Amino acid sequence: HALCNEEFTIFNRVDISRSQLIDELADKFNRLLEDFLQEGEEPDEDDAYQVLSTLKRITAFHNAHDLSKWDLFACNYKLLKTGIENGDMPEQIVIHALQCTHYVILWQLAKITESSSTKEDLLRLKKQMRVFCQICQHYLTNVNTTVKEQAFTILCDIL
């Protein structure tokens, strides 16, 4: 983010590099998630480690970078839904998914300011917001104290 300042004449190069990095991360995340959930059989542990590792990087970058063109809300929200439905997901996976989805919602708002977006985008943002709060509430009354702590922080800031 410090090297991606527009006023400096390096945005083209740093943006090319940014685009490659985020692209590889996104393709790997989607490919891994397809086999991860899969609805068909039981998942292993090393692939869970890889999924957590990739998500920890996507989340870390989505806090200062507008990773919106690579729409991930579907992926994160699906992952969280399978988590509620089964009740066996890893805690850190839940935490970082719950973080990345807050980030995508916040950036979606960041782009609703120019007024270039139609009324459909505002209603889409409302639809994503109400969906998010509902999932966060359940995760505010979980067994894992780390999960409940992350829920509280995110819910308070969103409100």
């Binding site: 983010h1 806090n63 200062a64 973080q99 807050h102 916040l106 950036w107 708002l109 960041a110 922080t153 995110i154 308070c156 800031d157």
Partner: protein, 37 residues
């Protein structure tokens, strides 16, 4: 970590910053513009 918490632990900063740390000034404005008088 204690240096940071002495930077931001003051209640004036505790009541003017997000709980989940947001680094980009865009998102910081998205939050802090909701801080009225």
């Amino acid at each position: 970590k204690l240096m940071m918490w002495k930077e931001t632990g003051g209640v004036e900063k505790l009541f003017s910053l997000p709980a989940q740390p947001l680094w980009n000034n865009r998102l910081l404005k998205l939050f802090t513009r909701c801080l009225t008088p």
